[PDB]
Symmetry: D2
Subunit: 250 residues, 4 copies
Amino acid sequence: NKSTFSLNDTAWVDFYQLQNYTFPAIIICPGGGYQHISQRESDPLALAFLAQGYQVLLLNYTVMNKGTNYNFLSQNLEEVQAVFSLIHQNHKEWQINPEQVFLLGCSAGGHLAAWYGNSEQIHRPKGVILCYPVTSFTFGWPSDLSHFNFEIENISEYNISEKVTSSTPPTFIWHTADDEGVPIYNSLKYCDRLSKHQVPFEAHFFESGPHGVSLANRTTAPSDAYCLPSVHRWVSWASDWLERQIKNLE
Amino acid sequence: NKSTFSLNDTAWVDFYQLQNYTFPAIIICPGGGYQHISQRESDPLALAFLAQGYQVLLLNYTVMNKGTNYNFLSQNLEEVQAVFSLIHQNHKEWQINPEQVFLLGCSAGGHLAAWYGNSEQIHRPKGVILCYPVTSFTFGWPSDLSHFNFEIENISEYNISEKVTSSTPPTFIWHTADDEGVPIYNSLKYCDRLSKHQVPFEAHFFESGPHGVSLANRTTAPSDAYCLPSVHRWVSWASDWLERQIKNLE
Amino acid sequence: NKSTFSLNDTAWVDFYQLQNYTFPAIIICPGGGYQHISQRESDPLALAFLAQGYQVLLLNYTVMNKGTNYNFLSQNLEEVQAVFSLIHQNHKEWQINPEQVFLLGCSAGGHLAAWYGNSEQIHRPKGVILCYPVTSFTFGWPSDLSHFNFEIENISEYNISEKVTSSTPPTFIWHTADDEGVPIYNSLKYCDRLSKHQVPFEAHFFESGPHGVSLANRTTAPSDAYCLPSVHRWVSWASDWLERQIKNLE
Amino acid sequence: NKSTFSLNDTAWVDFYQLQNYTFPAIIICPGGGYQHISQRESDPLALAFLAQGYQVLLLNYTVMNKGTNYNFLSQNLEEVQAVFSLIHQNHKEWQINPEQVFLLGCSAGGHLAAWYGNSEQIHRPKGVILCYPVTSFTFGWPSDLSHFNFEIENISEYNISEKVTSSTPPTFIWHTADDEGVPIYNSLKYCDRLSKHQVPFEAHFFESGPHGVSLANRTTAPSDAYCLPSVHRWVSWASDWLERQIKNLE
């Protein structure tokens, strides 16, 4: 039902599997500002989909929580890539349909997602979902000009907004129109710079809700304010969206 | 059940009423590029809401379909205003709760809506909805630089995007991310320039769908492509949104 | 959009029509214990469907409200029949698809519906819906042994439960499990005596709710207790059911 | 997140727990004709709820799969009882709200559920759900007069239909109107003999679908016929129902 698989020196990859087929899997990228891994965006999130009928690959990509040296922002893309690789070779055993692998991410964890959303091969996700994602370190986030800042002059490079082209996979993006950790602009501008390239996508923007809202269910929420029923609707919208994509495969 | 009320020299105002109370009414602004009145955004639209439990005031605001002279773009705001006025005085007879009047508009008909969405009094809509609205005559629409163009140098004035402030009522905006008549940018940029002013709103953006989609139901659609079930979901989202606002009025 | 058509000496037949095709029509049978016509089960109900994309034929079948003599319970079946007849001949003008005509009824109005649900010809409804229907004058209703009682020894004949066979069309039945006007047994036993004949159907039974609940919307409800959001869900279930049947054709 | 707890000589009790509170837990009773434990009604079912925000206690009650001797049909009630007991004492650690414990069961697993649905104490479930349950060994099931038949003359005693009174907790019952393993009559008659006792409940009956349908999702279904989207709606209806009860408890 579950077993972890070591990736690199610092990169866990939890793999959730069940059994009734070739269930379409989906890799998740929990947020946490590259610092850590927002727990309330992992296991809980996993179950959600695992219950919605999806093999889950929760990626614990390297972050500033294991002795940070260089901008592993590049080393990450590798880690996620390694996941697909893992599938590409263990797709028979994993009971996964290699032609039905998607990528998920929220907050910063999203940034990596959109990032990986280009320049790859038989590791390209047929689609991605970005929950209140981070479009660029130039969009209200990182809040502090100098924090997780470990150099690298080229900052415009770490703006996955520009890195969007016609080849970019279909995406689902939602965001609370009051998220103080990261302005909706992130998702907003991203959509604009996503439609102009005739990229099929769906977007949803809720009135209010704090950053890291996740499922907005009593499963993912510290206080009461983090438990929003109206916002929780996304996990449902996303379900329909995904499957709507599956059907449009052959 | 229904009876029209003459407004100005050129401005019909269809008023739909039913009876079980003080049902919250809602004024609609059918699109049609100020040229005419998109029929597939009127009566059908009316019923939708009238069925969802709302008194309907379909406004047939003056357009280039009755001998156009001057930019009545100002004379319109008056017309819609007259509607509220009509309610403000006939709210007891109309069985309408004056404290529960909302404004609806789509495509260009939306532009007027957002426009009226500021600078008024006891004629201020507790909320508005804008279906693939027109934010400004500078956002991909009017397609032709010179068509419905009847002068008036000051063009930036007819951009209801800037005309959005903290006083702007809560709004619901959706748009098909491929509408060729008017780019999603309209609603998109609008949202951005709507959130920054801490204005509570909800947004939805569908993958594909032609302009004037309306209800996306076999009630509002010329061909098959104009009949989209996934898009039709907005009229449902909108219902919940509205009522969510009503409850938030006690 | 609407125009009535005289049927018999005493039998109105309101016909609601709209225009974008050949929209599937649906005849309705408002309840009212054969005494009158529950208004809160007519016009409001009509719009509901008319909005859900269906031509509506509201039948004002003869009742004890126009000088009652004999048990017109037979004369009714005629009236409804006449409706189909009307369609069969004016199906081109009515813009109705003759192969997509359904029957609706609630409370007693339902009894007639199920009744007509057998022994006919090119007037057979491809499906019927029965809102808290009356299965027989022997199922807790009529409450009074002697009221609308105008003789006719053969009472078992007026039990449309037995009158159900394999030929009976697919039906949708819902009922509030506390309806004091008529026990759920009506719909309950009906389902049993509906499944045994391998008749495809769908049923729903809500916890609580008074008789005549109709849409349970602020459109159909005298007091607050008659406004139930959870119950209102049926009009939505019914929508999907119907259309699920439409698709289940050519 | 998960750990089993031995109950009796032959009775596993899988306990699924998560952590953000006092989440309302729910015990499940997987079906399998008392012979075994329908796998497709356990773990998958658990996740569903565990994702819907519920602590899950999957009960692996004794069955003819571990050397059957006597009609443990009585020994079962004990096993389930022990579960509540376990909670009643470990409700603080389990992070469970003892005043919010519900019972679930399907097919035969349901029979036990309804059964336990009376004659107990601080182990009474505030509500129960029964997916295509078994009302009595006299309702089309057991199919064979002599199979799991291990004596016990008193057969009418094993009919949990009669065992329903005003004290019986609110229940949610659904059933496919074509289930060949067990006729809908089970749930049908049960509803009748459930309403007459003014017991608040909700029912749903789908047109078609084989026995053991479970979630009707690609998570619980051997072939394609066992994957029904329309039927899968129950797990959603159930969610709302349950929570509707939580709110309406305090």
